[PDB]
Amino acid sequence: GSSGSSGTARLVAGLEDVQVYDGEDAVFSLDLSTIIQGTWFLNGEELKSNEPEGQVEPGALRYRIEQKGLQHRLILHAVKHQDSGALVGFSCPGVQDSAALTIQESSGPSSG
């Protein structure tokens, strides 16, 4: 919904790197200069607001997206390790930024 001139926007508070253990939950957010509607990305992939598509299924992981004027956010609950060093960024017509999601393994090589 674009009531007023929502051509482009400016970045005021870019994203930030976040590292969590396997199964944990990641959180990302950013600020803008004006209202706008962009798109989120994960591991170089274009996510959907309503429902995803392609090789990935709509029933693989749980995520939350909060879009409010110049306030975006994306939390990934139960982040898998296999997706270590993921790429979480919000692409929009006027701004371009992204972050790095590092995921370490809970257990390591000890016995065996």
CATH of the domain at 15: 2.60.40.10
The residues, any chain, with a CB within 8 Å of residue 69's CB and separated by 6 or more, are 32, 34, 35
Q: What domain range is 49 assigned to?
A: 1-112
Number of domains present in the structure of the chain: 1
CA distance 90 to 88: 7
Q: Does residue 95 contact residue 12 with C-beta atoms inside 8 Å? A: no
Distance CA 94, CA 7 (A): 8
Going from the C-alpha of 57 to that of each of 48, 52, 54, 91, the distances in angstroms are 12, 7, 7, 22
What is the Cα gyration radius of the chain? 16
Length in residues, the chain: 112
Separation CA 80–CA 57 (nearest Å): 15
Report the structure determination method: NMR
Q: Record the tokens describing residue 29, joined without a space.
A: 């957010």
> Is residue 82 within 8 Å of residue 59, measured between CB atoms?
no
For residues 21 and 103, is the Cβ–Cβ distance under 8 A? yes
Which residues have C-beta within 8 Å of that of residue 50, sequence separation ≥ 6?
none
**How far from each other are the two terminal CA atoms of the chain, in whole angstroms?**
57
Q: Under a CB-based contact definition with an 8 Å cutoff, are residues 60 and 77 in contact?
A: no
